[PDB]
Every structure is written in structure tokens, then in C-alpha cells.
Ligand binder design. Structure first.
Ligand SMILES: Cc1ccccc1-n1c(=O)c2c(C)c(C(=O)C3=C(O)CCCC3=O)ccc2n(C)c1=O
Ligand SMILES: Cc1ccccc1-n1c(=O)c2c(C)c(C(=O)C3=C(O)CCCC3=O)ccc2n(C)c1=O
Ligand SMILES: [Co+2]
Ligand SMILES: [Co+2]
Lengths: 380, 380
């Protein structure tokens, strides 16, 4: 049941912004490890004296990496005269964010029909304002409200090329890397208390709950067409293994974004390419499930995937789950930085043709059961 | 003339430590871009609740990347009970360093016969203490004194494997990258005033001055065998082009380390490998000199390098200079991070066989003249 209760017109995920200490090194690492191209920049060479911002793209996926310069470079500026291309940026907010949480997502950005209206309606419906609507070059409007912890939901709307004040990146500097990633599928928050978090976000967006010893309880909020998907987790305390949600909250100094799920047009090629690079600058993946997991794959998805497709899942450590309408292939990286906090999920969805409907196959909750069973069946 | 005035026994460069916001991402980028292997770690998985530290090695070159965790993880600790493997580390010093300078070198470390004595003698001779000698596992002694800005000179001495509390890195995580870099040749500071800087460092080390519109004046301090080489630059104001030393000081918020020079056993292979990776996560190089520069190469080094060796220099953008005892091949990267501050030099030295004596060929000062001449000769 989807009651289509969005309080403003939402289109799709637009971009994810990381706040960094050094945007250059994080962006180069991510570009190589994920196969994303350098597509736009805003930094000293473009006249921005406040922050360095580099955009990576793969298909529709946009990763933005931002870090502050010395405040002394812009000490004479005021907000009306700023050279920052992202006017919501603030030196002390960024340094405090990074000192508090380490490397992580500052903004989850979605494209809307009118960022000014989305903001007003959101705050009218309980959203805590973060940065008021600002019009850039009479061309783009951006506004921000608090989502959870120090993560903001950022509204972007266009009259009719990333943001004003960004330049396209030199063809020589932009190597056309591509491992198959095409768009952001969902973005997941960890909070101490799921209930108040759900009530707050659903309160100001109008997003509806999406049809659903693991360490957590979770729920998923969705836009009208269910293309914007925002799960939220809370810990479940006092168990055999310690809750990874609780571990996150401790090392992140509170609530924040837990994982980004990136849809691939070919998860087997994406994982082959990422795994080749794991030990030469890229990303590591979580430990592979036992062969018992893959022995049991035939009995549950043998109708969707061939024996060779299933054997390819075993080589790459891919996980498989399934809904009543579709099948999900997924895998998780190890944490992206120093702290055991944010990680990435690679996913591909099979089914729900109508175009493919959002959430087709779920989010892999059934893989908790199948992993536990397999990781006792393999013991013998 | 080398009066061998070292006030304690110095052996050679030991390691360079970068203070980072996220050690993981800087270290992975550097590993891929320079061809260095992951060799040791000290982090949560080794019991260190204070900082994450990752060591990269290539030959004798050791790059250490360190970033602080949340202070909350170690709030109950005191210095006697610390889990930090580098006891001179301090959360607030590290965050203040990085907020002030961005990514850069915190420590230039040299191996000495006794770090306790080196420290005492240094301070007895004017050095500003930074961290007193501390003995690790009755096996290694480390101490630190101020060098310039917020950069420290770190003394390390061993009784007879990087540091106690570091673990060797997993063979699966340690891919054997190698592009030919073998050791640190020199490490260069930028200061507002060269005179007082020279007097201060030479005062407490006993290092002697090494035989010597560019934007700078510079001088080089050397150990007894001249294997430890520490140039220092100051700006020269009011000129056609703005001093790059002055640009550094402005963007770095004061004095600090300007460049690290890494000796290659085969600079042509090193530069081929680094240049292949420039646009896929590695390092960019400064713009290549004009063909006039390379046309003039025959008349000055045609006796050292063949026509093919000189043509290979032109393909790779290598610079060549020469002393009275040796020849220097060198090239400079673009800045390593967001700010136009620290960069890397790749070098190879030809001559001065005795083993090769330090500084063989100089530091490339003559390449200022030859670059200016070439960059007017090419105009026509
Ligand atoms: C628990 C755990 C510990 C150490 C490494 C990995 C895991 N771990 C996961 O983190 C995990 C996740 C994060 C999802 C997932 O993507 C997800 C949810 O957890 C809630 C619904 C929305 C959503 O997107 C699904 C299955 C998972 N499974 C099966 C698993 O084992
Ligand atoms: C000035 C400048 C501007 C934009 C990019 C590059 C340059 N630039 C240099 O930075 C440069 C350096 C840094 C050295 C060098 O390694 C060095 C010194 O400058 C002082 C003595 C000790 C030492 O090691 C030598 C030649 C150089 N040359 C020729 C050059 O053009
Ligand atoms: Co997920
Ligand atoms: Co040099």
C-alpha cells in the first residue's frame, strides 16, 4: 500500500556530499576504487577561496567531495560577497563535523520541482531548517533541512551543469573510468531511536513506509514513485554478537549515514573490477559467505539465476535475496575510511517490470537468516 | 668543505609522518600513485583506541599516515595507560595541525644511535622540545623537537619491526607495488625568514651548510656523511611572478614542509608508472618544459645521457641539472592535496662513486635559469 502522501514533488536522488579533511585524496581514491569519472570542480582554480569541491560521476550517480581551505583566504568575505559555490558551506561546521564523525556523508541531495517550496513546506511540517533556500545564478535553487545527526537532506531544483560556479573537468584529467555503477538506490541512516526518527522525517516529507539477532530494527521511507528510498536502523541491545548499529553510533559519535547502495547495470562486472583494485588503492569487501550459503542458492533462486550465474556469485561473494516481486543481488564493502562507520553496498535488482519499480526485491533482510544458517551448516 | 660537526650520531632518514583527517584514504591514494606497499598498521584492530596509523614502504622509504579517532574512545586513558602506539600523538594537536595546514608532514624522522642523548644534546643546544624521549617495549626510543612551523624532527633509535605496537600487514592486503622508489633523498622546509631558521636548526644539530627571479633564497643543512639533507627556502618579494614560497606560506598558514625528494633506482620507469596512473587516482606532474629545454640538453649533458636517454627525458618531462661531481635528473608533482602547499620530487643521481656521496649533482637550482631561457627561446 502506497498512499502517495509526498508533500511536495520529489524527482530522484541528485547527489551525495562527503565532508572531508582533504577532498583531493578522498576523491581520487573513490574514483579509482569505484570507477567514477572526475566531472566538475569548484576550487581555487575556479575562484572559490572557501572550499575545494570535486564531483565524481558514474551514470546518474554523483558523489561530491568537499573540504575547507584556511579561513584566512576568505576572511574579508561576507555571505553576500562569498566565493563559495555551495553557499550553505561553513568552515567551522565542516571542521566540527569532521572532527566529530570523521569521513562521512554530510548531505543527501534530492531533485525537487521547487527547492523554495519544498523547504517552506518541510519546515511548516516540522523539519529543522539547516540552510535557507538560495538561488544560484538565477538558475538553480538549493535548500537544506536536518535529516538525522549532522546529516542534512538537501533540496535542489533547476529552472530548465552540476551547479553554478562549478567547471567541467579537463578531458586530460577526466579518465573515463566505468565499472557499471549507474545510480544511487538507497541511503541508510543509523539512529539511537527508530520511532522518533521515522516520525520526524515522515512528518515533514510525507514519505510513506515501504512494504517490508540481526542487531537492528529498521524501516524504509519512500517517495511517491518509490524511487527515493531512505531506510533507517536502530540497535537491538544485549545479544550474543554486539549490535553493529551500536558500534556505529559509538565510533561515529552519534547518528549518521550508515551505507549508500549503488545500483549496477551488471553487478558481476562491477565486483570483478572493484575486487581487482581492492589491494591497489580501492575498496575491500566484507568476508565471503561460506559455500553452504551458495549450495543453498539453487533451492531459492535457481529459477532466476543459472548454475553459472550462481557460481559467479560464489566467486565474487555476492549475496542474493528475494521478495514477492523481484530478486536482489547485493554485497557490502568494508568501512570506507578509518572508522567502522560508513560503508557502501553494490546492488542489482531483477524483476518488477512495468521500467523497474523501486525497491524491487527488498533490502536483503532475509540474508540475515540465510547467513546465520549457512554459517552453522558450514561448521559441519 | 664538510667540518663534520654533528653533535650526535645520525644514521639516515627513517620515516616521514603525515597527519591526515582520514589516514585510510590518503594512504591508499599514495600507495597506488607512488607504488608503495602496505607494510604495518596500528589501529583499532591492533588495540590502538587513539589513532589510526598506516605505514607504506618502497625500498628504504617509509611513509606513515596517521589520523585521530574520536577522543571518546580513549577518554578513560591517561598517558601511562595509553593504547596509542605513538605516545607523542595528541588528539587536539593533530586536529589543530590539520585544521591549520591541511594535509602535510608532521614529522621528519631520522635514525640516531641514541634518541635519548640526541634529544638532551639538541635541547641543550637550543632546540625547542616537542615530546620527551619515551622507550617503547624496552626496544625503541623516540623523541621529538621542533624543526619549523608545526613540523617536528623525530629521533628514533633501536637497541638492535617498524615500531612496537605495529603489526605487519596481511599478505592479501599488501599488494607488492613497486615503481622503483628506494629512499628519501631530502626534505625541504619553507619559512618566512631563512637566516633565523638556518641558525636555529644548525645550532642544535651541528649540521653544516652543504656546498651550493627564482622566487626564493635557499640553503641546505647536512649530516656528517651528508646522507641527511635538509634544505630550507625563504621568499623573495616584489617580482614579476609571485613567489611560490610566499604562496605556500599563505595557503599553509605559515612555515612548513615544502617538498619530499624520493630517490628512484630508475627514474624513467618510476615516471612511466606514475604518469600512467595520474588520471586514475595517482599524482599529476607539473607542466612539461618546452622542446627548447630538451634541444639544449645535448649541449650540457650529452656526455652523461645518450640521445635516446635524452629523448626519454623529453617524453617523461624530466629535468636535468649537473654539479661539478654529478648529474641530477628530477621532476616535480603537482600539490599532493587540496592546498598549493606540499609536493613531491622524484630524483635520480649520476656520479660521485666512492657507494654514492650525498647531494651528488645538487638540488637543481640551475634549472631555474635553463627553464627561463627555454621558456623564452620556445616563444620564437
Ligand atoms: C549485520 C552485519 C554485520 C557485519 C557486516 C554486514 C552485516 N550485514 C549488513 O550490514 C546488512 C545490511 C546493511 C543490509 C542492508 O542493506 C539494509 C538493512 O540492514 C536494513 C534495511 C535497509 C538496508 O538497506 C542487509 C543485509 C545485511 N546483512 C545481511 C548483513 O549481514
Ligand atoms: C619555481 C617553481 C614554480 C612552480 C613549479 C616548480 C618550480 N620549481 C621548483 O619548485 C623547483 C624546486 C623545488 C627545486 C628543489 O628541489 C629545491 C629548491 O628549490 C631549493 C634547493 C633545495 C631543493 O630541493 C629545484 C628546482 C625547481 N625549479 C626549477 C622550479 O622551477
Ligand atoms: Co541496503
Ligand atoms: Co628538491
Amino acid at each position: 500500500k502506497n498512499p502517495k502522501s509526498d508533500k511536495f514533488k520529489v524527482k530522484r536522488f541528485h547527489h551525495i556530499e562527503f565532508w572531508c579533511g582533504d577532498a583531493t585524496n578522498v576523491a581520487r581514491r573513490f574514483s579509482w576504487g569505484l570507477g567514477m569519472r572526475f566531472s566538475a570542480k569548484s576550487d581555487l582554480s575556479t575562484g572559490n577561496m572557501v572550499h575545494a569541491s570535486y564531483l565524481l560521476t558514474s551514470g546518474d550517480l554523483r558523489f561530491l567531495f568537499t573540504a575547507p581551505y584556511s579561513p584566512s583566504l576568505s576572511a574579508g568575505e561576507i555571505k553576500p560577497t562569498t566565493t563559495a559555490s555551495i553557499p550553505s558551506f561553513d568552515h567551522g561546521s565542516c571542521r566540527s563535523f569532521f572532527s566529530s564523525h570523521g569521513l562521512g556523508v554530510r548531505a543527501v541531495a534530492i531533485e525537487v520541482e521547487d527547492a523554495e517550496s519544498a523547504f517552506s513546506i518541510s519546515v511548516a511540517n516540522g523539519a529543522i531548517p539547516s540552510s535557507p533556500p538560495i538561488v544560484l545564478n538565477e538558475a538553480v535553487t538549493i535548500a537544506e533541512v536536518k535529516l538525522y545527526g549532522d546529516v542534512v537532506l538537501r533540496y535542489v531544483s533547476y529552472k530548465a551543469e552540476f551547479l553554478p560556479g562549478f567547471e567541467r573537468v579537463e578531458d586530460a584529467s577526466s579518465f573515463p573510468l566505468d565499472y557499471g555503477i549507474r545510480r544511487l538506490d538507497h541511503a541508510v541512516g543509523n539512529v539511537p531511536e527508530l520511532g522518533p526518527a521515522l516520525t520526524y522525517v515522515a512528518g515533514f516529507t510525507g514519505f510513506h513506509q515501504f512494504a517490508e539477532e540481526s542487531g537492528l530494527n529498521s524501516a524504509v521511507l519512500a517517495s511517491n514513485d518509490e524511487m527515493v528510498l531512505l531506510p533507517i536502523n536502530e540497535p537491538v541491545h544485549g545479544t550474543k554478537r554486539k549490535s553493529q548499529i551500536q558500534t556505529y553510533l559509538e565510533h561515529n559519535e552519534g547518528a549518521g549515514l550508515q551505507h549508500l547502495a549503488l545500483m549496477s547495470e551488471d553487478i558481476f562486472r562491477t565486483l570483478r573490477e572493484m575486487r581487482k583494485r581492492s589491494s591497489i588503492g580501492g575498496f575491500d569487501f566484507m568476508p565471503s559467505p561460506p559455500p553452504t550459503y551458495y549450495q543453498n542458492l539453487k533451492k531459492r533462486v535457481g529459477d532466476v539465476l543459472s548454475d553459472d550465474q550462481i557460481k559467479e556469485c560464489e566467486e565474487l561473494g555476492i549475496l542474493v535475496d528475494r521478495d514477492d516481486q523481484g530478486t536482489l543481488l547485493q554485497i557490502f564493502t568494508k568501512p570506507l575510511g578509518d572508522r567502522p562507520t560508513i560503508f557502501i553496498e553494490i546492488i542489482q535488482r531483477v524483476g518488477c517490470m512495468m521500467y523497474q519499480s523501486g525497491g524491487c526485491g527488498g533490502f536483503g533482510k532475509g540474508n540475515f537468516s540465510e547467513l546465520f544458517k549457512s554459517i552453522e551448516e558450514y561448521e559441519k
